[PDB]
Amino acid sequence: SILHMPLKIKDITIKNRIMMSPMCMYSASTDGMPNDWHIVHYATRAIGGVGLIMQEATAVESRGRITDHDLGIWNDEQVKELKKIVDICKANGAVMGIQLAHAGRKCNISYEDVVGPSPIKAGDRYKLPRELSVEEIKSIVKAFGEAAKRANLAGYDVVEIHAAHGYLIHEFLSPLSNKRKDEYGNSIENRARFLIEVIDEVRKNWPENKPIFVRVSADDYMEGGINIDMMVEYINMIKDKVDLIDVSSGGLLNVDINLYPGYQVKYAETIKKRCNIKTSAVGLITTQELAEEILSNERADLVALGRELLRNPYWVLHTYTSKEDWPKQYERAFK
Amino acid sequence: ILHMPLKIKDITIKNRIMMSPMCMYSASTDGMPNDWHIVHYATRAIGGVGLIMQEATAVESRGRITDHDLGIWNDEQVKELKKIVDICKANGAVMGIQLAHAGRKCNISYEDVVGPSPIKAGDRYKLPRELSVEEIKSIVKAFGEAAKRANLAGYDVVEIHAAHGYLIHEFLSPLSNKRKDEYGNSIENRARFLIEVIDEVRKNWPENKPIFVRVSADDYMEGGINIDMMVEYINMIKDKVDLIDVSSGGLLNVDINLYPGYQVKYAETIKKRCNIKTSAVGLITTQELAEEILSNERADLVALGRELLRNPYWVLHTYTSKEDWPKQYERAFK
Amino acid sequence: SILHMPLKIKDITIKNRIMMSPMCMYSASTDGMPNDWHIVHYATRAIGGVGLIMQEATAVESRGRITDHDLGIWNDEQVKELKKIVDICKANGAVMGIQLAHAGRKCNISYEDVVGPSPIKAGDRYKLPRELSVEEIKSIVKAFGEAAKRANLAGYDVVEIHAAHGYLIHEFLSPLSNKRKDEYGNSIENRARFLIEVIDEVRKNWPENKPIFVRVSADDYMEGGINIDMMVEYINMIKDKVDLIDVSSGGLLNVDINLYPGYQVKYAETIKKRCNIKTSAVGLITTQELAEEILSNERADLVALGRELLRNPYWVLHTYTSKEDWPKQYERAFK
Amino acid sequence: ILHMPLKIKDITIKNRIMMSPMCMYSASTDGMPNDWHIVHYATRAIGGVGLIMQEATAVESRGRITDHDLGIWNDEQVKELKKIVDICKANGAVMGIQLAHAGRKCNISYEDVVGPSPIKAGDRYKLPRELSVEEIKSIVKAFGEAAKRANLAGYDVVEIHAAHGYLIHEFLSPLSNKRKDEYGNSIENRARFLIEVIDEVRKNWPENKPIFVRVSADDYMEGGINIDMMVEYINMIKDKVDLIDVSSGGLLNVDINLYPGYQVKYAETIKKRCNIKTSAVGLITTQELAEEILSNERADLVALGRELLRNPYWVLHTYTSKEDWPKQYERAFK
Ligand SMILES: Cc1cc2nc3c(=O)[nH]c(=O)nc-3n(C[C@H](O)[C@H](O)[C@H](O)COP(=O)(O)O)c2cc1C
Ligand SMILES: Cc1cc2nc3c(=O)[nH]c(=O)nc-3n(C[C@H](O)[C@H](O)[C@H](O)COP(=O)(O)O)c2cc1C
Ligand SMILES: Cc1cc2nc3c(=O)[nH]c(=O)nc-3n(C[C@H](O)[C@H](O)[C@H](O)COP(=O)(O)O)c2cc1C
Ligand SMILES: Cc1cc2nc3c(=O)[nH]c(=O)nc-3n(C[C@H](O)[C@H](O)[C@H](O)COP(=O)(O)O)c2cc1C
């Protein structure tokens, strides 16, 4: 299958075109530490043949968590435990990525110091974020840098910056959530400033021969918000510094979105073609047939699976046509 | 979108699935259908297909591919073809007919094999006799007569077969059309035969019933049809027809990279650049891919060929309530 | 597959071990005539590779219909129409069977002459049946004989006598519905008398070289009714005169039955072994896997599929391992 | 019945699916498990398996099949095996261990290979030393010590591997047991080793935890074990053990007709003739067949081997509500 073709990014070779999409498991301690549940969860998909396993949103600071059972990477105790996930996944043949995250105004922890670019709620049930000063923005940029340094020490192959799903970076990017009148707002180049700064600081702390991905929401589905043309502008500002755009949509504010298989694929194809950068497609993809169409029609370079890999962790194994492709221990099960 | 109706002129198709035309090579040498064809098509109507497109049906006996093809070249064929129409409509499908002429790909040894230019389609083929302008006009008349017969048989939709290397395709492609008269040697002249066929069909087909055209959007060869050229042709005809059934290949032997949805980009390009309805076909087998194609607006209909041969009740399996099933089979709903 | 092995019964060779279980389509005229709907319905499963197609319950008298949209074979005019179904199925490679039926007290037609062995309703919604006289029983016996003569003229390969599902013959067989004190009731030999007479009359009118099947209900699931021991006794009385027992259960009176895949298979195996007769198994079998287990473990000689063949008419084709096994017209579709 | 609990002594299995024991050939030469085993078994616990039976675990180093097998012949292996037990129980499964001794089928060329009679398992195998009565006593002791260790590790169920051509099966079969002492000749004598092992395991295994025994109910060879012989053996042990895990073959190479449920008739026969619980195994892959076996009362448990290797969440796929899934995966219910 075309799904089985390796993809080389910098010095990292992904053995096939399937990525496990980052999915929060809400299973960490309030200290943000992974446990044996995480280790088995990720190892299972590495055994299952996934080319690139993207770890769930991992907070760069405690107020950057979505919930108080999220993983974090703000200290060295977390690194020692995250290293266990990395080691077992790579031992079992996967490339290991980490999604560095900051929930911003969508932090749902009742007692946290919730922050954002502008004092506007994400929805009725959320807290009003306090407006970051330029000095505080600098400190969060530094936090993404330190997190990337820690991720390198844990042994991750790939780092992904979470700039999507209505979280902190997305809030700076959208005119609907960013009403600032300083150097971080108004003009498109100013709205991009925080993302650009984060990518720059991550590069200072991440080996030049390892890939950097960025996950984006390519559409807010609202007048005045991000749309595909606006996202193309942003990607053109950063594409010389990053390796692949992980293409998603939505999340800034509640909107009724038409859901169907491949509902985000046109965004992935548009970014790939107009920006000439690698992309990954994600969103209600469950069949080998659709994954093959996406890759063969050059709509994306990687196909990411989320919920399908929750219920069907050996999905990739099922696609193999020879028993020699299976884990040696399971080759008697090839059918 | 899969279960959403599509109205085209006065005809409403109840869902977006079309049974792609597929030759069954089961007729007599007289081109008459039999019980085999009746059951074959009825089965997919029972299976819930929205639009059943009958296999290539020859407008002249020399326009057959084989001597077991269906024909509509004479009035005697109408009463037999009517049996197919009646049973499919009774069982809930819209019925279409693909009007066809095999041209230089006619594989009947004893027939009068014709084409635009005296060039073989391949080694095993007969050299075609080069058509005169008078003979071209006779073939155009034959398409018109076929459309009149189709209307009398009760078909809802007529598709002109302009693809797969057969007669009309042969006029369209520079690789097979070396004519230097009004039917060759410029893009407008190469489209002339198709345009004249469409015009004559329109004179013999009710204005409130749709006309589809199936095209090959790529010859996969330097010098031949490519997507840009097909866009030019579709722009010439789009005010006179209702939907472009998008396919590819057939003119000359070529290697083509095959994968699910390998002709879908052609269907999307035509739909967008020409602002016309299109149908997509080729190695689509899953509800998932069909839904993505329709919902990302890459086509207006999804055609299934081989999947409906092996899995005739494919549409029924997509329904979420027993009330959508044939009443007789209600107790089998999952 | 073992499913693919032929079975010869008398002069008739069934090409595989799959039977389409008889299923009423309630699509006939009030005159009991089939139409194009029946012809397509049965031909589809012949095209689908079914070895033996058993036509739905076909009434031997108009008062023996379940509904007034049932097929009939009570007059010579029905023959030439039924012959259309026979001819198309055989042309497409199937052996064609007909189930000769008489609804007895379960006749649901309000205006019909509803008859039974004893004046006891099948349930609250049914008509009180008229108690048959010995002379009337003789006429119904004659009707089955005339039906078998008609079936032979239509060209059916196999006749099945419907002695199950709470209908007329079953009513004579069960002590719960047969309270007669004449030669047709009040001992096991007397309760079998009607079935035996029907079989003898059918044989008088059915060529010796064509099989006779009998469908039975092997359990009433009620104290005092038929159970497997009683059915073994009945089959022992008829085994020298019939070729295969099509094994079912229930139908006499409303009862809660525990339903699951193969819930009637034990009865088919028990009759097969205890009576040394061929049997067919039916009931909630949908997978090639279960069908193969049944045949390979010698629990039955034929596997009957009902509802599965309604939803999945080409089930048998899907089991084939080669394109040349498929109808020639569909060979390009082999996957 | 599939989702119905089964209580055996004080142990409640939440459903009727057992992961059949399957060697992974991934341990150290010291018989130690590693993170590979922990993930392997944990995955099927997450997958909803009721009873996970750990692969053949050797009660002596010379009782391994290969030098990458798990061992339980020393106290140091206990702490490591406990990691498997703990994670499987935490994730909702009952944990079993198959206690094993390969006998003449030990495939370690340098090991002290032993059997009841000096006869090779095949040309590639080492000639086994014929066990003395005193050495037999010591192996019985080794099974007892293994069970004590298993209890310490926290296993819920112990299974004695008396099948597949290994040590106990070798005593059981006239084809492999040519002894003329108290452990050979008569049926009672051939059963003596198995009976002594069971007694010793019970001395070392809490009275409120169950003991299973896996058997080969047929050698498929004249003069070997057949179902009638196995029924007599089971009748000898049924008052001491809780369930018979029914398999076949393994003593010598033989051709066996393979199909779904090919060992199910052995399971049913033992269950009916001996009035003991049984488990069925062998080419069962569908929910449909598993349900038929359980509901027709042919066995009490259904064991899946190769199906759980390729499809570890098989049980989850049988659930009808999202609440039956691990909380973390609820959004993936379909
Ligand atoms: C339980 C769950 C947790 C998720 N957590 C994350 C996350 O940590 N980061 C992220 O970028 N997206 C997250 N998402 C979104 C998925 O990565 C994915 O983009 C989305 O579910 C669409 O793909 P799918 O249809 O294959 O599941 C999550 C989705 C689910 C269902
Ligand atoms: C047996 C067979 C007969 C065909 N006959 C026709 C035909 O009469 N007219 C036509 O336009 N295409 C014909 N084709 C092409 C199909 O309509 C269809 O476009 C092609 O098979 C790709 O779709 P699929 O992958 O769903 O089968 C035929 C294909 C097959 C396999
Ligand atoms: C619509 C329908 C009609 C039926 N008609 C008959 C019938 O005419 N004669 C008969 O013996 N059983 C009849 N039955 C029962 C089936 O033949 C079959 O025995 C039963 O449905 C169990 O098999 P299945 O689970 O494969 O459907 C009918 C069942 C259905 C669902
Ligand atoms: C890789 C592999 C390892 C096995 N190891 C064992 C074992 O340790 N103990 C045992 O009793 N059977 C063993 N067997 C047999 C299985 O437990 C099971 O009985 C057999 O594979 C048939 O069931 P299945 O068709 O569900 O796999 C093994 C089978 C395989 C394929």
Side-chain angles (χ1 to χ4, degrees), chain C residues 258 260-266 269 284-293 296-299, chain D residues 259-264 268 283-293 295-298:
Chain C
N258 184 36
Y260 56 83
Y263 71 110
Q264 296 170 326
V265 174
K266 263 186 282 155
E269 183 173 18
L284 286 167
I285 302 162
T286 76
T287 61
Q288 180 176 352
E289 182 166 288
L290 181 53
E292 286 177 347
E293 184 280 337
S296 293
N297 278 151
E298 293 182 316
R299 302 201 197 278
Chain D
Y259 54 83
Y262 73 110
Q263 292 170 330
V264 172
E268 185 183 21
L283 287 166
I284 304 159
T285 71
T286 59
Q287 180 177 354
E288 177 162 294
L289 178 56
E291 294 189 334
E292 185 277 334
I293 290 162
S295 288
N296 278 149
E297 298 183 280
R298 303 203 201 269

Coordinates of all heavy atoms in Angstrom, one line a residue, chain C residues 258 260-266 269 284-293 296-299, chain D residues 259-265 268 283-293 295-298, unseen atoms left out:
Chain C
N258 N -35.5 -18.8 24.5 CA -34.1 -18.2 24.5 C -33.5 -18.3 23.2 O -33.2 -19.4 22.6 CB -33.3 -19.0 25.6 CG -31.9 -18.4 25.8 OD1 -31.8 -17.2 25.8 ND2 -31.0 -19.3 26.0
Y260 N -30.5 -17.5 20.3 CA -29.0 -17.3 20.1 C -28.6 -18.0 18.9 O -29.4 -18.9 18.4 CB -28.3 -17.7 21.4 CG -28.6 -19.2 21.8 CD1 -27.9 -20.2 21.2 CD2 -29.6 -19.5 22.7 CE1 -28.1 -21.5 21.5 CE2 -29.9 -20.8 23.0 CZ -29.1 -21.8 22.4 OH -29.4 -23.1 22.7
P261 N -27.4 -17.7 18.4 CA -26.9 -18.4 17.2 C -26.9 -20.0 17.4 O -26.3 -20.4 18.4 CB -25.5 -17.9 17.0 CG -25.5 -16.6 17.7 CD -26.4 -16.7 18.8
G262 N -27.6 -20.7 16.5 CA -27.6 -22.1 16.6 C -28.5 -22.7 17.6 O -28.3 -23.9 18.0
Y263 N -29.5 -22.0 18.0 CA -30.4 -22.4 19.1 C -31.2 -23.7 18.7 O -31.8 -24.3 19.6 CB -31.3 -21.3 19.6 CG -32.4 -20.9 18.7 CD1 -33.7 -21.2 19.0 CD2 -32.1 -20.2 17.5 CE1 -34.8 -20.8 18.1 CE2 -33.1 -19.7 16.7 CZ -34.4 -20.1 16.9 OH -35.4 -19.6 16.0
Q264 N -31.3 -24.0 17.5 CA -32.0 -25.3 17.0 C -31.1 -26.4 16.5 O -31.5 -27.4 16.1 CB -33.1 -24.9 15.9 CG -34.1 -24.0 16.5 CD -35.1 -23.4 15.5 OE1 -34.8 -23.1 14.4 NE2 -36.3 -23.3 16.0
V265 N -29.8 -26.1 16.6 CA -28.8 -27.0 16.1 C -28.7 -28.3 16.9 O -28.6 -29.4 16.3 CB -27.4 -26.4 15.9 CG1 -26.3 -27.4 15.6 CG2 -27.4 -25.3 14.9
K266 N -28.9 -28.3 18.2 CA -28.8 -29.5 19.0 C -29.9 -30.5 18.6 O -29.7 -31.7 18.5 CB -29.0 -29.2 20.5 CG -27.7 -29.1 21.2 CD -27.9 -29.0 22.7 CE -28.3 -27.5 23.1 NZ -29.1 -27.4 24.3
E269 N -28.8 -32.2 15.4 CA -27.8 -33.2 15.6 C -28.4 -34.5 16.2 O -28.1 -35.6 15.9 CB -26.7 -32.7 16.4 CG -25.5 -33.7 16.6 CD -24.4 -33.1 17.4 OE1 -24.5 -32.0 18.0 OE2 -23.3 -33.7 17.3
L284 N -30.7 -18.5 13.2 CA -29.7 -17.5 13.7 C -28.3 -17.8 13.3 O -27.3 -17.4 13.9 CB -29.9 -17.2 15.2 CG -31.1 -16.3 15.4 CD1 -31.5 -16.3 16.9 CD2 -31.0 -14.9 14.9
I285 N -28.1 -18.6 12.2 CA -26.8 -18.8 11.6 C -26.6 -17.8 10.6 O -27.4 -17.6 9.6 CB -26.8 -20.2 11.0 CG1 -27.1 -21.3 12.0 CG2 -25.4 -20.5 10.3 CD1 -27.5 -22.7 11.4
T286 N -25.5 -17.0 10.7 CA -25.2 -16.0 9.7 C -23.8 -16.0 9.2 O -23.5 -15.3 8.2 CB -25.4 -14.5 10.3 OG1 -24.4 -14.1 11.1 CG2 -26.8 -14.4 10.9
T287 N -22.8 -16.7 9.8 CA -21.4 -16.6 9.5 C -21.0 -17.9 8.8 O -21.4 -19.0 9.1 CB -20.5 -16.4 10.7 OG1 -20.7 -17.5 11.6 CG2 -20.9 -15.1 11.4
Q288 N -20.0 -17.8 7.9 CA -19.4 -18.9 7.3 C -18.7 -19.8 8.4 O -18.7 -21.0 8.3 CB -18.3 -18.5 6.3 CG -17.6 -19.6 5.6 CD -16.6 -19.2 4.5 OE1 -16.5 -18.0 4.2 NE2 -15.8 -20.1 4.0
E289 N -18.2 -19.1 9.4 CA -17.6 -19.8 10.5 C -18.5 -20.8 11.2 O -18.1 -22.0 11.4 CB -16.9 -18.9 11.5 CG -16.2 -19.6 12.6 CD -15.3 -18.7 13.4 OE1 -14.2 -18.3 12.9 OE2 -15.6 -18.4 14.6
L290 N -19.7 -20.4 11.6 CA -20.6 -21.2 12.3 C -21.1 -22.3 11.3 O -21.3 -23.5 11.7 CB -21.8 -20.4 12.9 CG -22.8 -21.3 13.7 CD1 -22.2 -22.2 14.7 CD2 -23.9 -20.4 14.3
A291 N -21.4 -22.0 10.1 CA -21.9 -22.9 9.1 C -20.9 -24.1 8.9 O -21.2 -25.2 8.9 CB -22.2 -22.2 7.7
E292 N -19.6 -23.7 8.8 CA -18.5 -24.7 8.7 C -18.4 -25.6 9.9 O -18.3 -26.8 9.8 CB -17.2 -24.0 8.4 CG -17.0 -23.5 6.9 CD -15.7 -22.8 6.6 OE1 -14.9 -22.4 7.6 OE2 -15.5 -22.6 5.4
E293 N -18.6 -25.0 11.1 CA -18.5 -25.8 12.3 C -19.6 -26.8 12.4 O -19.3 -28.0 12.7 CB -18.6 -24.9 13.6 CG -18.4 -25.7 14.9 CD -19.7 -26.4 15.4 OE1 -20.9 -26.0 15.1 OE2 -19.6 -27.4 16.2
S296 N -18.8 -29.6 9.6 CA -17.6 -30.3 9.9 C -17.7 -31.2 11.1 O -17.1 -32.3 11.2 CB -16.4 -29.4 10.1 OG -16.1 -28.7 8.9
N297 N -18.5 -30.7 12.1 CA -18.7 -31.5 13.3 C -19.9 -32.5 13.2 O -20.3 -33.1 14.1 CB -18.9 -30.6 14.6 CG -17.6 -30.2 15.2 OD1 -17.5 -29.1 15.8 ND2 -16.6 -31.0 15.1
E298 N -20.4 -32.6 11.9 CA -21.4 -33.5 11.5 C -22.7 -33.4 12.3 O -23.3 -34.3 12.7 CB -20.9 -35.0 11.5 CG -19.8 -35.2 10.5 CD -19.4 -36.7 10.5 OE1 -19.2 -37.3 11.6 OE2 -19.2 -37.3 9.4
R299 N -23.1 -32.1 12.6 CA -24.3 -31.9 13.3 C -25.5 -31.8 12.4 O -26.7 -31.9 12.9 CB -24.1 -30.6 14.2 CG -22.9 -30.6 15.1 CD -23.1 -29.6 16.2 NE -21.8 -29.4 17.0 CZ -21.3 -30.1 17.9 NH1 -21.9 -31.2 18.3 NH2 -20.2 -29.7 18.5
Chain D
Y259 N -10.7 -27.0 11.2 CA -11.9 -26.2 10.9 C -12.3 -25.5 12.2 O -11.9 -25.9 13.2 CB -13.0 -27.0 10.3 CG -13.4 -28.2 11.1 CD1 -14.3 -28.1 12.2 CD2 -12.9 -29.5 10.9 CE1 -14.7 -29.1 13.0 CE2 -13.2 -30.6 11.7 CZ -14.1 -30.4 12.8 OH -14.5 -31.4 13.6
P260 N -13.2 -24.5 12.1 CA -13.6 -23.8 13.3 C -14.3 -24.7 14.2 O -15.3 -25.5 13.8 CB -14.6 -22.8 12.8 CG -14.3 -22.5 11.3 CD -13.7 -23.8 10.8
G261 N -13.9 -24.7 15.5 CA -14.6 -25.6 16.5 C -14.2 -27.1 16.4 O -14.9 -27.9 16.9
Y262 N -13.0 -27.4 15.8 CA -12.6 -28.8 15.7 C -12.3 -29.5 16.9 O -12.2 -30.8 16.9 CB -11.4 -28.9 14.7 CG -10.1 -28.4 15.2 CD1 -9.1 -29.3 15.5 CD2 -9.9 -27.0 15.4 CE1 -7.8 -28.8 16.0 CE2 -8.6 -26.6 15.9 CZ -7.7 -27.5 16.2 OH -6.4 -27.0 16.7
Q263 N -12.1 -28.8 18.1 CA -11.9 -29.4 19.4 C -13.1 -29.3 20.3 O -13.1 -29.8 21.4 CB -10.7 -28.9 20.0 CG -9.4 -29.3 19.3 CD -8.2 -28.6 19.7 OE1 -8.2 -27.4 20.2 NE2 -7.1 -29.3 19.5
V264 N -14.2 -28.7 19.8 CA -15.4 -28.5 20.6 C -16.1 -29.7 21.0 O -16.7 -29.8 22.1 CB -16.3 -27.4 19.9 CG1 -17.7 -27.3 20.7 CG2 -15.6 -26.0 19.9
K265 N -16.2 -30.7 20.1 CA -16.9 -32.0 20.5 C -16.2 -32.7 21.6 O -16.8 -33.3 22.4 CB -17.1 -32.9 19.3 CG -18.1 -32.4 18.3 CD -18.6 -33.6 17.3
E268 N -17.4 -30.8 24.8 CA -18.8 -31.2 25.2 C -18.9 -32.6 25.7 O -19.6 -32.8 26.7 CB -19.6 -31.0 23.9 CG -21.1 -31.2 24.2 CD -21.9 -31.2 22.9 OE1 -21.3 -31.4 21.8 OE2 -23.1 -31.0 23.0
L283 N -9.6 -22.5 16.7 CA -10.1 -21.8 15.5 C -11.4 -21.2 15.7 O -12.2 -21.1 14.8 CB -10.1 -22.8 14.3 CG -8.6 -23.1 13.8 CD1 -8.6 -24.3 12.8 CD2 -8.1 -21.9 13.1
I284 N -11.7 -20.7 16.9 CA -12.9 -19.9 17.2 C -12.5 -18.4 17.1 O -11.5 -18.0 17.7 CB -13.4 -20.2 18.6 CG1 -13.7 -21.7 18.8 CG2 -14.7 -19.3 18.9 CD1 -13.7 -22.1 20.3
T285 N -13.2 -17.7 16.2 CA -12.8 -16.3 16.0 C -14.0 -15.3 16.0 O -13.8 -14.1 16.1 CB -12.1 -16.0 14.6 OG1 -13.0 -16.2 13.5 CG2 -10.9 -17.0 14.5
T286 N -15.2 -15.8 15.9 CA -16.4 -15.0 15.8 C -17.2 -15.0 17.1 O -17.3 -16.0 17.8 CB -17.4 -15.4 14.6 OG1 -17.8 -16.7 14.8 CG2 -16.7 -15.3 13.3
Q287 N -17.8 -13.8 17.4 CA -18.7 -13.8 18.5 C -19.8 -14.8 18.3 O -20.3 -15.5 19.3 CB -19.3 -12.4 18.6 CG -20.4 -12.2 19.8 CD -20.9 -10.8 19.9 OE1 -20.5 -9.9 19.3 NE2 -21.8 -10.7 20.9
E288 N -20.2 -15.0 17.1 CA -21.4 -15.9 16.8 C -21.1 -17.3 17.2 O -21.9 -18.0 17.9 CB -21.7 -15.8 15.3 CG -22.8 -16.8 14.9 CD -23.4 -16.5 13.6 OE1 -24.1 -15.4 13.5 OE2 -23.3 -17.3 12.6
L289 N -19.9 -17.9 16.8 CA -19.6 -19.2 17.2 C -19.3 -19.3 18.7 O -19.8 -20.3 19.4 CB -18.3 -19.7 16.4 CG -17.8 -21.1 16.8 CD1 -18.9 -22.2 16.7 CD2 -16.6 -21.5 16.0
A290 N -18.7 -18.3 19.3 CA -18.5 -18.3 20.8 C -19.8 -18.4 21.5 O -20.0 -19.2 22.5 CB -17.7 -17.1 21.2
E291 N -20.8 -17.6 21.1 CA -22.1 -17.6 21.7 C -22.8 -19.0 21.5 O -23.5 -19.4 22.5 CB -23.0 -16.5 21.2 CG -22.5 -15.1 21.5 CD -23.5 -14.0 21.2 OE1 -24.3 -14.1 20.3 OE2 -23.4 -12.9 21.9
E292 N -22.7 -19.6 20.4 CA -23.3 -20.9 20.1 C -22.8 -22.0 21.1 O -23.5 -22.7 21.7 CB -23.1 -21.4 18.7 CG -23.8 -22.7 18.3 CD -23.1 -24.0 18.7 OE1 -21.8 -24.0 18.8 OE2 -23.8 -25.0 18.9
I293 N -21.4 -22.0 21.2 CA -20.8 -22.9 22.1 C -21.3 -22.8 23.5 O -21.6 -23.8 24.2 CB -19.2 -22.7 22.0 CG1 -18.7 -23.2 20.6 CG2 -18.5 -23.5 23.2 CD1 -17.3 -22.7 20.3
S295 N -24.0 -21.1 24.7 CA -25.5 -21.2 24.9 C -26.1 -22.6 24.7 O -27.1 -23.0 25.3 CB -26.2 -20.2 24.0 OG -26.0 -18.9 24.5
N296 N -25.4 -23.4 23.8 CA -25.7 -24.8 23.6 C -25.1 -25.7 24.7 O -25.2 -26.9 24.6 CB -25.4 -25.3 22.2 CG -26.5 -25.0 21.2 OD1 -26.2 -24.7 20.0 ND2 -27.7 -24.9 21.6
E297 N -24.4 -25.1 25.7 CA -23.8 -25.7 26.8 C -22.8 -26.7 26.4 O -22.7 -27.8 27.1 CB -24.9 -26.3 27.7 CG -25.9 -25.3 28.3 CD -26.9 -25.9 29.2 OE1 -27.9 -26.4 28.7 OE2 -26.8 -25.8 30.4
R298 N -22.0 -26.4 25.4 CA -20.9 -27.3 25.0 C -19.6 -27.1 25.8 O -18.8 -28.0 25.8 CB -20.7 -27.2 23.5 CG -22.0 -27.4 22.7 CD -21.7 -27.9 21.3 NE -22.8 -27.6 20.3 CZ -23.7 -28.5 20.0 NH1 -23.8 -29.7 20.6 NH2 -24.7 -28.2 19.2

